[PDB]
């Protein structure tokens, strides 16, 4: 019940580059390399959920100004059209999926708080027993343009070949991230949004509060979590008209001591990095 | 009669990544990009011609020693088995393709000779007129590990969008290199080999000389020149058993001002770089 049982790295590549689509995760599964003896959406959206609009055309009205100016008794109601100049306010038919917030850790240790927060700060659910939320609801790992942060228990973590059982270093393990699904899913380490916490009046300002967890609301859409060559298990052709070339999964051509996904001098087969399948793209 | 007339960059990608195979090169061809109004083996060998041997097993004898040691009257004949320890001397059934040597030029200008050698130092043929040899026979552009050098007239040089007509800088053009064909083809800037220039005797040393050009000899095998998205014109599925993943042509993941192979703000379509056809690999 893992993909690398049935797929070679080249067969896996043949699958993920050309195609839009096709039980406790325990050990003892059939080896990924046939000589050893032992004892779904696959694309990344090319558009975000908030950008689906036509950029050239105005729309509907929103509330632009609650005060004419500074002073006393300046209350007013002014309205504007939603359009390309301000895209944040426009009306939209669909909204991003549910979220249950994960604590954010940094691969740079000095960015992290100096305290043991591994079990203390993690998200969890009760059943009178506490169970860590892992990996949890599907959420993007980090915001676009961020490479050092990762959710505390948000994503799957595989060990490299030869990694020990207990208290291994960061380098030894491989942590998967799901940036690709960020277009329609909330970031795992961020609030889902803000709500209004009161009724305003002349004497009390409008108050807001953060939403740390948000369940299913009508109109939400989301992407599920990706499958990996190493991950658990339980063709659709690429029809796209895209003009410019796709991102494909490839192997770097640069002299190295070993070949990736091949045996080394001592006969040990290894899988260098986690390969998930989201490379081609679709319009949202 | 150019490939980008008939193929989009995306369609070109599908062709070169998935397949092993499928008039003076003047201007005036239909524009690469459809909105403008105007006035073969696609693979790289995974083995090299000199290495086709079984690395674990011996072969046939060669002449190892012509003298016992330092001294006088030391003439003797020794022989050894051709085997893995010395692979240079083994008997081989097939030898690399023909060559006509090109002058070598570096893209680092300070290590180029300080003289005008464009026309004087160029390989050429005569038919009472002297025609430059361009691009010439199919030959590798450079030795593995030297990317800076290119044959003076050896490769096809395409201009970038907007490049002027006369005396443009080296960054206004695109220089293609046939790196992939080196396995079966001699380097364009290197001699084909050495031959004996005399009969050795007790009174004369064995004298050799460089072969600067070579025509077809029985038992040569060679690759033809690659074709490009831009280049002139006038399917086979991949059967490979390779375990590890192939090299593919991929777009870059980094953020940039403009998307590759698209229009900019002024509406000018451009092709950022040349695309060869050779990515998948075969055995030799």
């Amino acid at each position: 019940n893992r993909f690398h049982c049935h797929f070679s790295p080249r067969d896996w590549q043949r699958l993920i580059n050309n195609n839009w689509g096709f039980g406790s995760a325990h050990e003892g599964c059939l080896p990924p390399f046939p000589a050893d003896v032992f004892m779904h959406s696959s694309y990344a959206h090319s558009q975000s959920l908030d950008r689906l609009m036509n950029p050239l055309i105005d729309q509907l009205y929103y509330l632009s100004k609650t005060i004419n100016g500074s002073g006393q008794n300046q209350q007013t109601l002014k309205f504007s059209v939603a359009g390309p100049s301000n895209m944040a306010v426009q009306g939209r038919n669909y909204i991003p999926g549910p979220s249950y917030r994960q604590q954010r850790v940094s691969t740079t240790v000095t960015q992290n708080n100096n305290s043991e927060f591994a079990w203390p700060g993690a998200s969890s659910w009760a059943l009178g027993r506490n169970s860590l939320m892992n990996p949890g609801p599907a959420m993007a790992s980090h915001k676009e343009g961020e490479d050092r942060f990762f959710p505390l228990s948000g994503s799957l973590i595989f060990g490299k070949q030869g990694t020990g059982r207990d208290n291994v270093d960061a380098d030894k393990v491989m942590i998967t991230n799901e940036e690709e699904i960020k277009t329609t899913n909330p970031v795992a380490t961020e609030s889902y949004g803000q709500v209004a916490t009161n009724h305003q009046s002349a004497q009390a300002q409008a108050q807001t509060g953060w939403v740390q967890n948000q369940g299913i609301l009508p109109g939400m859409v989301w992407q599920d979590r990706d499958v990996y060559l190493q991950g658990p298990i339980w063709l659709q052709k690429e029809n796209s008209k895209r003009w410019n070339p796709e991102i494909q999964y490839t192997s770097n051509y640069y002299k190295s001591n070993n070949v990736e996904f091949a045996v080394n001098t001592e006969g040990v087969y290894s899988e260098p990095r986690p390969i998930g399948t989201r490379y081609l793209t679709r319009n949202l | 009669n150019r490939f980008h007339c008939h193929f989009s960059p995306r369609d070109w990608q599908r062709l070169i990544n998935n397949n092993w195979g499928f008039g003076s090169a003047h201007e005036g061809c239909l524009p690469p990009f459809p909105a403008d109004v105007f006035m073969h083996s696609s693979y790289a060998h995974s083995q090299s011609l000199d290495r086709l041997m079984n690395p674990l097993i011996d072969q046939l004898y060669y002449l190892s020693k012509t003298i016992n040691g330092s001294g006088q009257n030391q003439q003797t004949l020794k022989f050894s088995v051709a085997g893995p320890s010395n692979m240079a001397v083994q008997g081989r059934n097939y030898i690399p393709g023909p060559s006509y040597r090109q002058q070598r030029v570096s893209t680092t200008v300070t290590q180029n000779n300080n003289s005008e050698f464009a026309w004087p130092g160029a390989s050429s043929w005569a038919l009472g007129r002297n025609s430059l040899m361009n691009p010439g026979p199919a030959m590798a552009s450079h030795k593995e590990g030297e990317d800076r050098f290119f044959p003076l007239s050896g490769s096809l040089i395409f201009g970038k969008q907007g490049t002027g007509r006369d005396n443009v800088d080296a960054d206004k053009v695109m220089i293609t290199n046939e790196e992939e064909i080196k396995t079966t083809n001699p380097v364009a800037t290197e001699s084909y080999g050495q031959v004996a220039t005399n009969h050795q005797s007790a009174q004369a040393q064995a004298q050799t000389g460089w072969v600067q050009n070579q025509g077809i000899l029985p038992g040569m095998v060679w690759q033809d020149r690659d074709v490009y998205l831009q280049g002139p014109i006038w399917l086979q599925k991949e059967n490979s058993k390779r375990w590890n993943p192939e090299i593919q042509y991929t777009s870059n993941y980094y953020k940039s001002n403009n998307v590759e192979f698209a229009v900019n703000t002024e509406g000018v379509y451009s092709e950022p770089r040349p695309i060869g056809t050779r990515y998948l690999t075969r055995n030799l």
Partner: antibody
Framework: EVQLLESGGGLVQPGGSLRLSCAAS????????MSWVRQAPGKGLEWVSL????????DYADSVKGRFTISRDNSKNTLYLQMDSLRAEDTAVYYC??????????????????????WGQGTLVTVSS | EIVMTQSPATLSVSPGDTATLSCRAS??????LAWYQQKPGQAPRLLIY???TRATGIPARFSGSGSGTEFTLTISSLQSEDFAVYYC????????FGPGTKVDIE
């Protein structure tokens, strides 16, 4: 092969700011993390600042912090360094350097940089009046 | 701010002789280190990384050793091609270099 080449460095008066650039080629620039390192004329080597991959993570040495800003343009395979508010204490040869470890979208930038894999021929910066 | 210490401040040996270079670390750096030679008027070049591994294209006469605080660089069969200052780096916490050791020829 890998080739790191540093552009203009000159003479700047104290408090002046100049910009350095490094043209990298022969390797996929976006994938690796680039670093500036400094050698004062008689002194040994000192690391200055690092930028990784996309440029999301940037760190500086405590000596240069707040004066210096590093940036890269993956589009043009160039690394930049903007020196601001220089002192006479900030004059040495500057080296463009490369991280060995390879970065792709399916993974995270390693927390720290490793040994320096390749080096450019450094450009010199004198700060004096 | 682990402080690195290059044990010989300078050194002089004749060609063909082994030369034992060593540096120390203010705190444990476990098999995270490197060795560079800087010839006069050149940029440094990687010799050894981790504790002992030779960089690609480096002669086999260079060898590293040591873990934790103290490390050693040894040059077998020293030649005249080698005249350089040798540095050691740590890639634990924030990178710091040793002061260097100049190997002088007799």
């Amino acid at each position: 092969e890998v080739q790191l080449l540093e552009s203009g460095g000159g003479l700047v008066q104290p408090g002046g700011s100049l910009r350095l650039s490094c043209a990298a080629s022969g390797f996929t620039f976006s994938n690796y993390a680039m670093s500036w390192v400094r050698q004062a004329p008689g002194k040994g080597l000192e690391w200055v600042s690092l930028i990784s991959g996309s440029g999301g993570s940037i760190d500086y040495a405590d000596s240069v912090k707040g004066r210096f800003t590093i940036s890269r343009d993956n589009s043009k395979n160039t690394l930049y360094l903007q020196m601001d508010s220089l002192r006479a204490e900030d004059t040495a040869v500057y080296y463009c350097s490369k991280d060995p470890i390879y970065y792709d979208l399916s993974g995270y930038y390693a927390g720290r940089i490793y040994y320096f894999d390749y080096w450019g021929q450094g450009t010199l910066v004198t700060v004096s009046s | 701010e682990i402080v690195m210490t290059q044990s010989p401040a300078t050194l002089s040996v004749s060609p063909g002789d082994t030369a034992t270079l060593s540096c120390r670390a203010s705190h444990s750096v476990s098999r995270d280190l490197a060795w560079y030679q800087q010839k006069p008027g050149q940029a440094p070049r990687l010799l050894i990384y981790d504790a002992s591994t030779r960089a690609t294209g480096i002669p086999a006469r260079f060898s590293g050793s040591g873990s934790g605080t103290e490390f050693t660089l040894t040059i077998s069969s020293l030649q005249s091609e080698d005249f350089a200052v040798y540095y050691c780096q740590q890639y634990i916490n924030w990178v710091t270099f040793g002061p260097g050791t100049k190997v002088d020829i007799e």
